[PDB]
Amino acid sequence: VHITLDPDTANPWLILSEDRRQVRLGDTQQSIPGNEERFDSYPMVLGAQHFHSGKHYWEVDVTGKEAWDLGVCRDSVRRKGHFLLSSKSGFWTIWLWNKQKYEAGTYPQTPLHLQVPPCQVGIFLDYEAGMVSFYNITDHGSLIYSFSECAFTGPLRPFFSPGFNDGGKNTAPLTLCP
Ligand SMILES: CSc1cc(F)ccc1-c1ccc(C(=O)NCC2CCCCC2)c(S(C)(=O)=O)c1
C-alpha cells in the first residue's frame, strides 16, 4: 500500500502537501480543530494506514534536516500532552537529534554510529516477525537498526516527525518516496 499522511493526526506546527506524501514545519502554528486524534504538544503525524498483519515498506527523504524521528507506533498511542517514545508507550522509532546524533528508541537509548548521514531512510515492518528495520539508503542500503521480538498484538501506524520548531534550522521537508 502507498503510505499517506493522516491530516487529522498532524500537530498544528505541521504543513502537509496536497498529496499527503510530504510534511514540514511551519513558521507558525496553523489554526485547525482540536480533535481527539491530533498530536497537540509535538510536531508529529501518523500515516493513514492501519497495519494488522504482513510486511510493509516505505522510504523517507530527510535531506538537509538537522533532526527527525521515523518509525511505527500503536494505533492506541496517546495524542495529548507529553510522553516518551518508548516501546512501553507503543513506539518503535529512530531519530536524529542536533545534526549529528542518531539514536534508536530502546531503553536505555542505543546510539547509532552512521559514518554516512542518510538522505533517505528505508523502513520495513514485519508484523508477524515482530520486526521494525531501518536502512541507510545513502550508504548503499546498510542496516541502521532493527527492533526485534516486538510482539505486536494490535493495529500499527507509520509514525513521523520532521523535528521541533527551531528558528528555521529544520524547515526542510520529510517526503515519502515512490
Ligand atoms: C517530536 S519527537 C522528535 C523529533 C525529532 F526530530 C527528533 C527526535 C524526537 C524525539 C525522540 C525521542 C524522544 C524521547 O521520548 N526520548 C526518550 C527516550 C525514548 C526511548 C526510551 C528511553 C527514553 C523525544 S521526546 C518525546 O522526549 O521529546 C523526541
Author numbering: 287 to 464
Q: Which text from the study accompanies this structure?
A:
Tripartite motif-containing protein 21 (TRIM21) is a member of the TRIM family, characterized by the presence of a RING finger domain, a B-box motif, a coiled-coil region, and a PRY-SPRY domain. Within the TRIM family, it has a unique role due to its specific binding to the Fc region of intracellular antibodies (AB) and thereby marking antibody-coated proteins or non-enveloped virus particles for proteasomal degradation. Central to the function of TRIM21 is the PRY-SPRY domain, which mediates interactions with immunoglobulin Fc regions. The PRY-SPRY domain contains a deep binding pocket, making it the most druggable and therefore most promising domain of the TRIM21 holoenzyme for therapeutic intervention.
Based on the discovered scaffold, we synthesized the representative ligand AL236 (1) and crystallized it under similar conditions as previously reported. Human TRIM21 PRY-SPRY domain at 10 mg mL−1 was co-crystallized with 500 µM AL236 (1) using the sitting-drop vapor diffusion method, with a reservoir solution containing 2.3 M sodium chloride and 0.1 M sodium citrate pH 3.5. Crystals in the space group P62 with a single monomer in the asymmetric unit, were grown with drop ratios of 0.1 μL protein, 0.1 μL reservoir solution at 20 °C. Before flash freezing in liquid nitrogen, the crystals were cryoprotected with 25% ethylene glycol dissolved in reservoir solution. The structure revealed that the ligand is occupying the whole pocket and binds by a combination of polar and nonpolar interactions. Similar to many fragments, it forms π-π interactions with the two tryptophans Trp381 and Trp383, as well as a polar interaction via its amide to the backbone of Leu371. Further structural analysis indicated that a promising strategy for an exit vector is to replace the terminal cyclohexyl group with a piperidine moiety and conjugate the BODIPY dye via a PEG linker to the piperidine nitrogen. This resulted in the tracer AL244 (2), which demonstrated desired properties. Initial measurements in life cells (intact mode) showed that AL236 (1) effectively displaced the tracer, with an EC50 of 197 nM. Under permeabilized conditions (lysed mode), we obtained a similar result (EC50: 297 nM), indicating a high cell permeability of this compound.
